[PDB]
């Protein structure tokens, strides 16, 4: 865009002169009738007038013209309307570190309208990505990707229609297609682990995937943990050279399980509180193995389940229900309130109580109402957005701040008897939808009832 | 395209003056016939009038001119009317996997009017294409090809007549001419299957 200001002062000095020549003719008429006491007359007249004029003239003139001009211009090119910049991090959930990390990613609009596919350049290189780490670290800010040319001298471009669709729909997703990265190997010469720039994990990962059984487990803080364990493919003679792997041995060595009393346990929790899931090939093979073993409960025969290559075993927790992505979300009515009952002292501003770290991740927020002796609903602060009332503690006593909406002040106890109810919403009950219509009456959704105490009992 | 808005306020203060000098001649005539009960007369007259005038004048003037101007412009270059972008996937229906996949493809209009022949760049590299698989995977969205050049700093250009024919006929086909890609071989030393970047399936 550009703005132009212009001033203009014009002095116009003008001359003029003139002559004129007029020639005028004229023919007059007249009649007249006069009358007196005894005298009457009449008269007839006519006149012939010529005339001739000549007008000589001259003029001088000034003019002072002052002008102020304001102008504004907005140029645009429909092919190069917008430039993009991503703020991204790198996450290693694996087990081995990867060196010289260069992911190949993709900017995508809409359903599958791909804007661009970009390989990570030398500004975007990560030297080390150790497992259970981020690049860059979590305290630091994520990195910026804004380039297309392998030499980082050209920005990523968006045209006009995609720009309009982006500002309408706000749907811009990011895909991780493939990741480049090297292995550093040990040297027996001097002990120094050195990077081979020639070899990459691209050589190695399909070799691992085609020779192992994969097991995903989420009993450690509802987080999907994947481990691949070498197991025998019978149709491959080299693959049959491995020792046999039972399922129980695999679960023992892979997840740190134990039988402290002859019973397979993850931490202090029994294996029988976990449920098993298989894809169709692995489920068929487990069906065949249980048919041969003449057993029904799999939990009894875990030391006898022979594993094979390319198996897939999902092991979850029965108490909490999950989504399509197997993310923790919210259990049965026989689980919530069945155990969320602590003996603690009631107070103002908020509720100091200890909620189990696993259990709290399945709740989206809380609802605080007040019940009459006869029974009346006067929700303290309604709407989905103001629903979140939970916080973090330094000693383990996760707060529920009731002094959040009452003018940055405390709850209104109109009577000591007045019952103070606090409820919670499972992620499968209250949704991501925030103030769709701004009304959003919190009464119309599944609410469980955990805490219920008398105000006078509070003291 | 560009739009321009313009406002203009003009104050014009004007002066004028004048003189004039008129010289007028005039020749009048007259005849007259009078009649009574017993009295009849007649009369003849003529007149000679000179005259001379001089008009001296002066003028002052203001002018307030307010203007609002709207303008719109659409520039175009007939050789560079359109830019292209393909959304494509890679399919392996074979039996052996192929590594560092770089297909050579072709954008074609009409019957055989080839727009462009583009080798896959480093944004378009596929490290692994195992058989009975796609690059990228079917849940993900296909990849974008929009740059014929090596360092990939030039969009895929279409001129005017091809642009008109494309928006009329909607026939834009894609050919797969040849595919670059390497073999990884087994090593008897450590069991590790390693890529020879020198050899390619073109030999084989």
Numbering used by the authors:
A (entry chain G): 277 to 735
B (entry chain A): 277 to 480
Q: Which of the paper's sentences describe this entry?
A:
Protective antigen (PA), the binding component of this AB toxin, forms an oligomeric pore that translocates lethal factor (LF) or edema factor, the active components of the toxin, into the cell. As the endosome acidifies, PAprepore undergoes a conformational change to a pore (PApore). This pore inserts into the endosomal membrane to form a channel. Three clamp sites aid in peptide translocation: the α clamp, the Φ clamp, and the charge clamp.
To prevent aggregation and migration of the nanodiscs to the air–water interface, we plunge froze the grids within 30 s of sample application. Using our TITaNS methodology, we obtained a 3.3 Å reconstruction of LFN translocating through PApore. Our reconstruction shows a loss of LFN density in the canonical binding site above the PApore. Notably, our reconstruction does not show density for residues 50–135 in the canonical folded LFN position. However, density for residues 136–250 are apparent. In addition to a loss of LFN density in the canonical binding site above the PApore, our reconstruction shows added density inside the pore lumen indicating a translocating complex. We attribute this density to unfolded LFN interacting with the benzyl rings of the PApore Φ clamp as LFN is translocating through the pore. In addition, the density for each of the PApore F427 residues was smeared in plane with the benzyl ring suggesting rotameric states moving up and down. Notably, density located at the PApore charge clamp is consistent with an α helix and suggests the deprotonated state of LF favors helix formation within the pore. Further down the pore we observe density for helix α1 emerging from the channel exit. Interestingly, the receptor binding domain did show different conformations for each protomer and indicates a degree of conformational flexibility.
